[PDB]
Amino acid sequence: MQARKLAVDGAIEFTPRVFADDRGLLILPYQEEAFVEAHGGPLFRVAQTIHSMSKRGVVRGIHYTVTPPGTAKYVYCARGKAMDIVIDIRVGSPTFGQWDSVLMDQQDPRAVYLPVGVGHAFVALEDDTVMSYMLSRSYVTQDELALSALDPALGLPIDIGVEPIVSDRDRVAITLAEAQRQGLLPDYTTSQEIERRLTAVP
Amino acid sequence: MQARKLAVDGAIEFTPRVFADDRGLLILPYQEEAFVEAHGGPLFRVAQTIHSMSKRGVVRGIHYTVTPPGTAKYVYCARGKAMDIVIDIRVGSPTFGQWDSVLMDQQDPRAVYLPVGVGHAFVALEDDTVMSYMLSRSYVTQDELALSALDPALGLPIDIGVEPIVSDRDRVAITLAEAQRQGLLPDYTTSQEIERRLTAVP
Numbered sequence: 402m403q404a405r406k407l408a409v410d411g412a413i414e415f416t417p418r419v420f421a422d423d424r425g426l427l428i429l430p431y432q433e434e435a436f437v438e439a440h441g442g443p444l445f446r447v448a449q450t451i452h453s454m455s456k457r458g459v460v461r462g463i464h465y466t467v468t469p470p471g472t473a474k475y476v477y478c479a480r481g482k483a484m485d486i487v488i489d490i491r492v493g494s495p496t497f498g499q500w501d502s503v504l505m506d507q508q509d510p511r512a513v514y515l516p517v518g519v520g521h522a523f524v525a526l527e528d529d530t531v532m533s534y535m536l537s538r539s540y541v542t543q544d545e546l547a548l549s550a551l552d553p554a555l556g557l558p559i560d561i562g563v564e565p566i567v568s569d570r571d572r573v574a575i576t577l578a579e580a581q582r583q584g585l586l587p588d589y590t591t592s593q594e595i596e597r598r599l600t601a602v603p
Numbered sequence: 604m605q606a607r608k609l610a611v612d613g614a615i616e617f618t619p620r621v622f623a624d625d626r627g628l629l630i631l632p633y634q635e636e637a638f639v640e641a642h643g644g645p646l647f648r649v650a651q652t653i654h655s656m657s658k659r660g661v662v663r664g665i666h667y668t669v670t671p672p673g674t675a676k677y678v679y680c681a682r683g684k685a686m687d688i689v690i691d692i693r694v695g696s697p698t699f700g701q702w703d704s705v706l707m708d709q710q711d712p713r714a715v716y717l718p719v720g721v722g723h724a725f726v727a728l729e730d731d732t733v734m735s736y737m738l739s740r741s742y743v744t745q746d747e748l749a750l751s752a753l754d755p756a757l758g759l760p761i762d763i764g765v766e767p768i769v770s771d772r773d774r775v776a777i778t779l780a781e782a783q784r785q786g787l788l789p790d791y792t793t794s795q796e797i798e799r800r801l802t803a804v805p
């Protein structure tokens with residue numbers, strides 16, 4: 402497993418080796434040693450998992466959790482192909498307002514660790530694209546907020562030549578700048594404090 | 604999410620609801636609240652995950668970890684279709700020697716919790732079948748043992764109309780009864796002690 406720090410502070414791309422034999426293939430998308438090496442502590446305790454399947458051209462996001470309590474996440478693409486996007490919405494972060502992207506496919510699988518307090522989006526590049534997540538806390542509707550992924554300010558890589566397929570909640574989402582003004586974005590210091598508790602060495 | 608106790612003591616089948624919209628489908632394969640209700644405590648700390656893809660007719664198993672240290676697992680089928688099999692190989696268990704099976708498909712997805720000490724096997728019923736696991740301990744080759752899945756004493760449902768595709772290590776595995784005589788099986792009491800430590804609420 403190789404680890405590469407993303408441009409959004411604390412976000413990490415992991416590239417597992419793919420093992421093949423006559424029966425099929427194997428990857429180990431999360432591995433404690435590689436994770437600790439890159440992050441400095443183990444994964445959060447897992448509260449919930451997600452299996453999301455999307456049609457080509459679906460854009461989901463930008464999703465974040467009200468912080469506190471916040472949510473950290475670990476995601477990979479288990480089928481199909483996605484452009485995964487991390488957006489740093491943590492006020493005070495050295496990388497506030499920046500994003501980075503990871504192409505997730507089946508030939509060269511990559512997983513991403515999303516710190517507490519960041520935003521997540523993706524676009525499905527193929528039908529039957531599965532995004533598989535581990536979360537640090539169960540999804541609670543009242544704590545789950547959204548920002549506009551289509552915000553021309555951000556210029557996210559979410560246009561693939563079809564009209565995007567977007568939910569109501571994502572379509573009407575306010576922009577990053579509007580959320581900031583309203584006091585709705587996570588604070589970087591607070592986010593890192595929570596994150597260090599979640600990923601503390603037992 | 605609904606939970607159902609399997610015939611192997613402590614093994615549990617979870618049935619998440621399938622949510623659908625214009626974008627696709629969503630299931631939540633692992634959910635802490637349902638898990639805690641059924642098991643009595645939260646999932647183990649996740650040491651490692653697995654993404655395994657198999658051709659139709661592959662049979663993997665029966666696999667178990669030397670106990671101690673042992674491994675508990677949580678598994679679901681993220682693509683394709685599998686017959687998932689849990690085998691109680693824990694000497695002293697009230698359900699020793701029994702197995703149970705769960706059909707894992709895309710239409711009515713099911714996840715299974717495998718206690719410490721039990722054996723696991725599955726048969727892939729479609730090409731490109733993906734089994735997705737969370738593990739309590741990282742895989743260590745020297746601790747990963749096998750038992751014969753073809754054992755006539757068990758009658759596992761593993762031939763589906765094509766010549767089974769089996770690894771050499773699985774093909775030459777000894778039977779459950781032989782492994783018991785050789786002293787190679789997990790002990791139930793020990794397994795339960797490990798399990799209680801892993802899944803403690805504190």
Ligand SMILES: Cc1cn([C@H]2C[C@H](O)[C@@H](COP(=O)(O)O)O2)c(=O)[nH]c1=O
Pocket residue numbers: 451540542545568570622629631
């Ligand atoms: C991702 C997720 C969504 N949901 C629900 C909330 C919404 O009613 C619906 C779609 O959510 P979404 O707008 O975040 O895609 O599914 C959960 O209950 N738990 C989850 O983990």
Ligand SMILES: Cc1cn([C@H]2C[C@H](O)[C@@H](COP(=O)(O)O)O2)c(=O)[nH]c1=O
Pocket residue numbers: 420427429653742744747770772
């Ligand atoms: C399942 C698994 C297998 N392996 C290795 C051991 C073997 O050399 C090969 C196949 O293992 P298997 O016979 O248990 O399927 O993959 C790992 O290193 N980590 C894992 O988690």
